[PDB]
Amino acid sequence: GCRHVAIIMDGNGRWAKKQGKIRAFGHKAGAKSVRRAVSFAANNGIEALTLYAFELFVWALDSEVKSLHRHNVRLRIIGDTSRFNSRLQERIRKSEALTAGNTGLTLNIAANYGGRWDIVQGVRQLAEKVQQGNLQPDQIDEEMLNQHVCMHELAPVDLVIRTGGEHRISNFLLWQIAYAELYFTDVLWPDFDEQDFEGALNAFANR
Amino acid sequence: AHGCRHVAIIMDGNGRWAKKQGKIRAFGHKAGAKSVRRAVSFAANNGIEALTLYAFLFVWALDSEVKSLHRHNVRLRIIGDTSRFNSRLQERIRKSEALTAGNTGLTLNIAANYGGRWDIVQGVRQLAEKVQQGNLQPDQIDEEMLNQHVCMHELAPVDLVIRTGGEHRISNFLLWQIAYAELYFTDVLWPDFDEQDFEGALNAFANR
């Protein structure tokens, strides 16, 4: 019954250091874990999967987009990409446009995202409307702010997973997690595998 | 030493506690009120600056505790949407706030008809009002600004959120305010949650 899973993918640095290796090695094992979690969600009928890594990261996704598209995956980047270079912004817009019509798993990749930023960008929009005389203070309600925060078109976030041992949201989704199950595991992101993902889905199923 | 200035607690488990012992709901609420007094005293004696309680006619007959709070030098505040509350419910709240506002010990915030989303929304409305008066430009609105308009912005940031009763969600409780907070869930039911359980959450925040 779990429709939308968000993951705070923490522990790449600590994993690398445990393996006696440099940071980049953790990243490469992190990316393999990303692919495994994406495959697992698409195989198990999850509607939306939202991943928060806790420009270089987005660039690496770029070469995977053709393969996501074949898999009927809809890709979106959420977060403030407005100071990214224009070449990268255009590559992001093209990948989103390429997959926007896909009807399988929606994969949201947070890039320079903050939950408070997300709320503020939606408040800014309402503020522009009030100034234009197009809305009244008294008309702003939860429903309306909801319509201006990221992911408002998707199933509500049902489950948030944080790997890596910390017990904090760290300014990932805030508005969107009002009623979500929160599942924290000490497993580090590169080790987080199908069995760990299923274990989290069980916690939800028990709720 | 523990390092929390501000602890918030989702106090769940009262109903389950009373059921476990074949008692009706009201006996749980009552054990739960005893557990509130205990948590309040414990916070006041362990140098916490602020304790924010979300209970998950509660507020009413609770007037009857305001004199006792005042005698413990606790500053009382109600957060939440009380604007559609009964005549004078609103007045007795205001006088309770006024009476204790000079207190210098623990600040105790009691959520009454509170939701985290509503909290953000009221702050957004204060901001929209100022835009409409021509006082505020949309592009001056940043996080620091909205932060100044949500409940409790003048108190230390929330360091730690405790939720008793075994569920692992926020259930709409502080959403903006808990962006950086430690989250601590215990299966202990609210009426059983005692000083050593509170110590255990604080020491967990200190170690983590």
Ligand SMILES: CCCCCCCCOc1ccc(C(=O)/C=C(\O)C(=O)O)cc1
């Ligand atoms: C740190 C960057 C991580 C980038 C990983 C992006 C997620 C890609 O996940 C995938 C998941 C599945 C597949 C996959 O199924 C590809 C195919 O089925 C195919 O090419 O025919 C390919 C990629």
Ligand SMILES: CCCCCCCCOc1ccc(C(=O)/C=C(\O)C(=O)O)cc1
């Ligand atoms: C009805 C909802 C919960 C009721 C408690 C509201 C807050 C009261 O906090 C208190 C904290 C400490 C004390 C206190 O010292 C009480 C006593 O010595 C006593 O009741 O005999 C009393 C109240």
